[PDB]
Design a protein around this ligand. Sequence first.
Ligand SMILES: CN(C)CC(=O)Nc1ccc2[nH]c(=O)c3ccccc3c2c1
Lengths: 188, 195
Amino acid sequence: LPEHWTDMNHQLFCMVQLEPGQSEYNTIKDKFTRTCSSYAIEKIERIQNAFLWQSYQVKKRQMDIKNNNERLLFHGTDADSVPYVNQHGFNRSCSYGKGTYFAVDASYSAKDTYSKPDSNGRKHMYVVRVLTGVFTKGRAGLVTPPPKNPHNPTDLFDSVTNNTRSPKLFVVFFDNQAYPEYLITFTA
Amino acid sequence: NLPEHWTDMNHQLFCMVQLEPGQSEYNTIKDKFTRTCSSYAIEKIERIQNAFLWQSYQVKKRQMDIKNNNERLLFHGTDADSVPYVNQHGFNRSCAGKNAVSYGKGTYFAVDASYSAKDTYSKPDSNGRKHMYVVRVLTGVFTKGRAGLVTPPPKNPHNPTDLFDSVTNNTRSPKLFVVFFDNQAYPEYLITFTA
Ligand SMILES: CN(C)CC(=O)Nc1ccc2[nH]c(=O)c3ccccc3c2c1
């Protein structure tokens, strides 16, 4: 488990609210305001999920071995999906393909369509480690990433993007490819 | 890290190992198959040695043993065309076929081999070969399913994140299980058989 995590008293999951003014809080704030300077951050929480982390890191080492595979991306969701995501992560079962979507810019996940405001006006987006690895442009109807070689349909790309030259979003089609690291609660 | 009974796979992240009849390993799998499919003939049995699928699955199994008898050895019949993909990548619910009677949108596994042996599942290729996997499936704690499930239901309606590990057709007498997550099943053997 990461050293910068706080003690979880032999628990496997906990949300650790960050302290403003500290490097950790500010680093995340900086990546958000970089494109969302008009929004007001209410709080930032470090998601400490021992189980999700384990599966993700296993996935990461497999990808490093099989091929710079990790990207820090954004994911805005409604309030109701937050509890599930904290515990279980991102599910494709819940358009450049039918997987989970993650934005390069926080501005993109800030849209009400994504970070849908709750009755109190709060919006939610995750700061996510995503295993984008080797990618290709996507297309609707993808249920899995395309094969690197059409004549070896089992060697797959790790993710897809909207535009390979200037990626603004990535899509992953498997469970343990995204780790929600922080949850940003913010308002207008 | 990998099972010590596995053949060397040097430099391979994966390989299919053909089993020898007369062996406990081959014979036992044959016995579980013929237990309900005595009318079919087994062409061959291959052990699936997938390093990555195994690692992920075992991490997932470790986690379900802590959170909660979570593993079942079940059958999965597929067409020939899905074999290559399942060997490398395992079972995908996004590519999963609608079951005749549906208890959710995930990958299905049978208790009896007789069930998976139906042409609708282990579809005969042009040569008449049928295919089914022997799978280690993390069923864990389960409940009766229902169509339109995209994940397992919560053990409790008011704590919607604490989920069941799988769903079945009948809790008292389970003949099939459905899993909705990627590494809850490891394809351990591939049974090729004929009429
Ligand atoms: C039908 N979908 C709109 C359901 C949904 O929840 N989508 C969703 C939900 C969250 C999303 N978060 C993102 O950062 C993002 C970035 C680029 C493109 C999409 C997203 C994004 C999309």
